[PDB]
Design a protein around this ligand. Sequence first.
Ligand SMILES: Cc1cn([C@H]2CC[C@@H](COP(=O)(O)OP(=O)(O)OP(=O)(O)O)O2)c(=O)[nH]c1=O
Ligand SMILES: [Mg+2]
Ligand SMILES: [Zn+2]
Length: 1025
Amino acid sequence: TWKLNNLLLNDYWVHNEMKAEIKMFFETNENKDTTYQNLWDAFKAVCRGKFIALNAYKRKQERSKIDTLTSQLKELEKQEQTHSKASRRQEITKIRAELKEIETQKTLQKINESRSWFFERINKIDRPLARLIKKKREKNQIDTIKNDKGDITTDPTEIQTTIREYYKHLYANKLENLEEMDTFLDTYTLPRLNQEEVESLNRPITGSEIVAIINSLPTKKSPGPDGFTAEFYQRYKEELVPFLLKLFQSIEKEGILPNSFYEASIILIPKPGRDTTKKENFRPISLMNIDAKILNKILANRIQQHIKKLIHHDQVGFIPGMQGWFNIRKSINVIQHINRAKDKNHMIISIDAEKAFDKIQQPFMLKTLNKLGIDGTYFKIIRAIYDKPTANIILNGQKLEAFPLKTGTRQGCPLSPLLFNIVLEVLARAIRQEKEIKGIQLGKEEVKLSLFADDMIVYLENPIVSAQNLLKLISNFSKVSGYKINVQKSQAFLYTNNRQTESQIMGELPFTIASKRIKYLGIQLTRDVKDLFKENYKPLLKEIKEETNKWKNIPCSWVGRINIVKMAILPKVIYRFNAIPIKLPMTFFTELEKTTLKFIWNQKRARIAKSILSQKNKAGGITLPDFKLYYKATVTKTAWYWYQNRDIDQWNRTEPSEIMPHIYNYLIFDKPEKNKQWGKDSLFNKWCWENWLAICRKLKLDPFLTPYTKINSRWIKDLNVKPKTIKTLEENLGITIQDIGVGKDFMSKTPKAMATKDKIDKWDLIKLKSFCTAKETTIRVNRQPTTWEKIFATYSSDKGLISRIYNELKQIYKKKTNNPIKKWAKDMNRHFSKEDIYAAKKHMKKCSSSLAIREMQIKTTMRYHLTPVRMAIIKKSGNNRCWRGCGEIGTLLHCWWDCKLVQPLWKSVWRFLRDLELEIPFDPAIPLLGIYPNEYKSCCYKDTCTRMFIAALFTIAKTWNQPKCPTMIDWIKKMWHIYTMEYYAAIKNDEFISFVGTWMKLETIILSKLSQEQKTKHRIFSLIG
DNA sequence: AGTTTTGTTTTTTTTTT
DNA sequence: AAACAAAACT
RNA sequence: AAAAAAAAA
DNA sequence: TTTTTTTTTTTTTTTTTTTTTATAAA
DNA sequence: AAAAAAAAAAAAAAAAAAA
DNA sequence: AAAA
Ligand SMILES: Cc1cn([C@H]2CC[C@@H](COP(=O)(O)OP(=O)(O)OP(=O)(O)O)O2)c(=O)[nH]c1=O
Ligand SMILES: [Mg+2]
Ligand SMILES: [Zn+2]
């Protein structure tokens, strides 16, 4: 089976001829005889023909030389068999040399192109470094199956039969009781779209909507069964989009898809931590054609706009703007309520659907869409999509015969997650409506359910009655929907007063009772909340320690090991903070910091101080992660939700509250409280407040009356004003006191405000007028807002809060550090200005794109390298003399610049600089630090000089303690290595116009100095010329 | 007039189902 | 995380 | 070896 | 009820003690 | 020579007792 | 060397 090779798209000739047939095919073909649905499948066949012909001609042509050499050489040696001749043997030798030459040239270029790609990515958070810590990807091979007879069988054809019969049977059985589906849908009250919303679904597709979806398709993904990739559609989007538009307009009119839209390839993926030999334990993922996914993406984007009308906020899975941590914190709050309660009669149940996407009955799903009011061209296209889908299974690389999909949604389709949620929402609305299943009461809140996709947790009171009635409702939903609950995964916590009562209830119900803990959404829920640190955070420390110990000998530098900690450790640490922001002992941070540094410095003491690595400005952009500041950023983030006061955020309302249950609405940018018994038992919210207040006083803010203080605040409510007045202002003028006006501007800011000024209850206005015109009010409200205050007040999205708060916290807590650049200035007798120190820092960032070259420069500036002076102090010895043996004191400036064994190399470099006809003083600050004297500031040759000097640093460092001169030829080899890596990458990026500027002059000089012998031994030849 | 800072856009990996 | 664009301040 | 949402660099 | 005083915890600053054996390439 | 850790002080908040 |  063909697949498009994406490298084939790169090529100028291939693009030109393919782009020519795309135009030619449609202008010839497009006539009344044939529909677009057929015409589109005919086009794809022709286009697949062309690519195979163009591949073959390309691949023949590139060996044409070797064809001619091999025939020509074989002809002369074919004569050599009959008679042996001298001059023929000479020509044979000549041509046979050239054949071996081109064999070598092809081999080297393959190696150098591979190396160049890796040279750009090294030590970067990228696929190579990700793969270094990963194991090998493990192949998709079924060689053993547990058999229907109970036997283990490895006969391949019996494997191919046993798998196919099982997957064919799973999808086969379509329910047929359509009368009962109506009766259940009538039983319960469901939402509906209005006429304006419905018109938004059914509107015509347009060219701008298509190109937007093409631009966003993921690159580097497997194609569908017809073999075309996302990169094809992105490349020819100009020619294709007119014809794609004609296709979708034809599908709207008729509700008929092309035949290829139904095709998909199933690949079987083993589920983690289950027997592979059981056929029961594989996940069938489906590969679909990219044109079919472009249509399905259109439909999913349209329904997603409305989805918050259809789906209650108990469901957070797949929904835009929701967070999984919402359900975690709500659940922990409920468990604490049960722990405190005097009379315990309560149960908490975790439920998962078995094969949730595969068991959805398609007739019930289409009835549900009609019951919500979805009809017209949108419903017509959805019905066409489920009309006859089929799958082929690809086992051991061999493509089996295809079966119909009579049930389920495809797992691998963009439209499947939302359709599943809309069907599950019918059951959720039924459970909430039914009052003989009793929720738990938390002050004024009732909590029955939390959902995350197919994952369900249920909170019940009086379980013997409530649990039986829940099961009966799910039985009835199963009969119509096909939904089924997964008996192996399902667990409960049961709370009762006496052992006898637990014994009886356990006998009734089908569920498995968890004594200590239930794993939930990535974390452990504990039966008592006091256990919460022990079960979640102490394991996480132990798991990070084991993980760094395994990696201890990986072959990367401290630069790469820092990036491993960011990529692998940091995401899981942030996830636990965000789910469970409880108050953590400082020993947690001490253990986490020691472990992480011990890994980065390879169990030897640090070469560069963690203080210096803290700031991006220092050490060339390399920066260490600060775990205490990420913790603080996560804890204070909650205050953004307190200010917003959203009706969806029921997770915030459910903390225990004897005193002042509304207080969190009042805390932020609002007036202080004199009662200080609130949040006495709070797990999360009280600790958030104490962190918020500490940061405000660090900044020297007054947090209590601000440019952002709301009209709906305690300030105005302590004035005794009627709610009709307060809400009138929010409806008419704005949210904040500043929107009203204060002092001189009290209402007079705008004509619409002065028009309002008469509209208020006569007594209220005089009360307001006194407060707004007071002297303290005028000063406090008129000040400029800081950046900290803008984070919590201004932004409408929660997106990216941790990232913003962390960047503020690093400026607020910024420390003093020693500067190595000042110590260099003391080793030389010179002063460096603030402008020089800035130049050294900019050079340390901009010397190269590769981390390999940048690391060398960073190590040199930051005084990384050991010296005899340092070692004499450490070893408590007088033997401070140069390891090379020139007899002088081994200072760092001796080692790099002044040792007579190093000096002949640096004079070589300056002799090249004179051949470039530059002029530069002979001054250690220029090559080592990158600090040039002012006259040279404006020169354009700095990029060339940077490659010359860093090559010299590599040469000296590779022989650091050895009693011999670094040589000019070793320098030339390094400089040529860098030239080769940059050349192939430059062509790949088409940066080649810049590349020729930098290297072209330098390359001519290097080649002039070598002999033909040296050039051959070291393979030094021009890649530009 | 030049340099520095802020914000958006393109590219990586990890978390859940 | 990088680079480019845009606006303000030295 | 595919999909959706979220997070960080 | 309000104000004052004492106790505990956390953060910042300064002093004192200890280190690794060469490096880049891999 | 340089980095890290420990030690000591200072500051604020919380709780109790008296004005 | 640490990708397709
Ligand atoms: C993890 C994962 C999940 N999905 C979707 C589609 C199904 C639902 C539920 O997944 P689940 O693990 O319950 O699997 P399920 O089918 O429910 O099988 P079980 O019977 O629950 O084991 O999420 C997916 O598309 N890709 C994935 O990699
Ligand atoms: Mg499931
Ligand atoms: Zn020396």
